[PDB]
């Protein structure tokens, strides 16, 4: 069961693609955080979604906002994918324990062992203000993400 | 799961895993036909693993022939192994010990519980399914492939 708007966003500490520790708590009081769970690196739909994030990165990484992509892949997988795709935003590894953060947000697929396509906006207080989960074959709409982020500044 | 690395004399645990093209590969399928080299590696796209599998690729005829087969195994899913294999020119099977995470690695006693990856374990399984060679190096150490071909050569015919 996916966490809803109004819930406290579970805290986490995860390695990014360069093996550096990134914590959700660190953004508190400073930026609104977009969390983009994705199932697997090197797949077509995931490529398309993170490409859109890359293409509009200034709307997601700025003085008001940050964006974190999260999947069960380990850092080396995310590093190569990021380098080859030109992703400069953090890709975080929910790798070991496998899918623990995804489970805490209620967006883990127990059967396949991957995160579903869940998206959250966490405000400066650590409260979830936006929550979506998409069905297969559909691509998430990035205009919703920027709109939700814009609504939490002005 | 065993508490230590499986050693020579043990039955090699059977497994069925997806290779980089999502095809099922089973250890049992080689029984009575070929000696099987099992190369556990921690992570795709890392320098040491690149070097080790490059060396395997460069000497592939000594590992894939009438007497021998070689399988590389790691916790990565097939799409990860597919891209790595295509870009590295690996034509041998890379198998996904992905979900359940590290289950086969644990059955061989070569799983690193702390990091959640396979250690650099290597086995030779003979035509009867018995382990005849067993080593375990840590993710920061490099293995000697001369030992692999030596062990395979000793089991021919």
Swiss-Prot record, chain A:
Domain Thioredoxin: 3-154
Enzyme class: oxidoreductase
KW Thylakoid (keyword) present: no
Domain of life of the organism encoding this protein: Bacteria
The species this protein was found in: Mycobacterium tuberculosis (strain ATCC 25618 / H37Rv)
Active site, renumbered: 46
The protein's role, per its UniProt record: Thiol-specific peroxidase that catalyzes the reduction of hydrogen peroxide and organic hydroperoxides to water and alcohols, respectively. Plays a role in cell protection against oxidative stress by detoxifying peroxides. May represent an important antioxidant defense against cytotoxic peroxides, especially peroxynitrite, which can be formed by activated macrophages during infection.
Signal peptide from the UniProt entry: none
Protein name: Alkyl hydroperoxide reductase E
Keyword Oxidoreductase among UniProt keywords: yes
SUPFAM superfamilies given in the database record: Thioredoxin-like
Enzyme Commission code(s) on record: 1.11.1.29
Family stated for the protein in its record: Belongs to the peroxiredoxin family. AhpE subfamily.
Catalysis performed (reactions): [mycoredoxin]-L-dithiol + a hydroperoxide = [mycoredoxin]-L-disulfide + an alcohol + H2O
Note: The active site is a conserved redox-active cysteine residue, the peroxidatic cysteine (C(P)), which makes the nucleophilic attack on the peroxide substrate. The peroxide oxidizes the C(P)-SH to cysteine sulfenic acid (C(P)-SOH), which then reacts with another cysteine residue, the resolving cysteine (C(R)), to form a disulfide bridge. The disulfide is subsequently reduced by an appropriate electron donor to complete the catalytic cycle. In this 1-Cys peroxiredoxin, no C(R) is present and C(P) instead forms a disulfide with a cysteine from another protein or with a small thiol molecule.
Keywords for the protein's UniProt record, in alphabetical order: Antioxidant, Oxidoreductase, Peroxidase, Redox-active center
Subunit structure: Homodimer. Forms both dimers and octamers; a tightly-associated dimer and a ring-like octamer.
Pfam assignment, any one: AhpC-TSA
Classification via InterPro entries: AhpC/TSA, Peroxiredoxin_AhpC-typ, Thioredoxin-like_sf, Thioredoxin_domain, Tpx_Peroxidase_subfamily
UniProt-recorded Gene Ontology molecular function terms: peroxidase activity; peroxiredoxin activity; thioredoxin peroxidase activity
Source species taxonomy: Bacteria, Bacillati, Actinomycetota, Actinomycetes, Mycobacteriales
GO CC annotations on file: cytoplasm; cytosol
GO biological process: cell redox homeostasis; cellular response to oxidative stress; response to nitrosative stress
């Amino acid at each position: 069961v996916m966490l809803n708007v109004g819930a406290t966003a579970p805290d986490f500490t995860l390695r990014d693609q360069n093996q550096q520790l990134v914590t959700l708590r660190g953004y508190r009081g400073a930026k609104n955080v977009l969390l983009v769970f994705f199932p697997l690196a090197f797949t077509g739909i995931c490529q398309g979604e993170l490409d859109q994030l890359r293409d509009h990165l200034p709307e997601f990484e700025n003085d008001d906002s940050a964006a974190l992509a999260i999947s069960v892949g380990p850092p080396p997988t995310h590093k190569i994918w990021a380098t080859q795709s030109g992703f400069t935003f953090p890709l975080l590894s929910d790798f070991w324990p496998h899918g623990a953060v995804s489970q805490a947000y209620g967006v883990f697929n127990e059967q396949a062992g991957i995160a579903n396509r869940g998206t959250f906006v966490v405000d400066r207080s650590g409260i979830i203000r936006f929550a979506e989960m998409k069905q297969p074959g559909e691509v998430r709409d990035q205009r919703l993400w920027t709109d939700a982020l814009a609504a939490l500044t002005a």
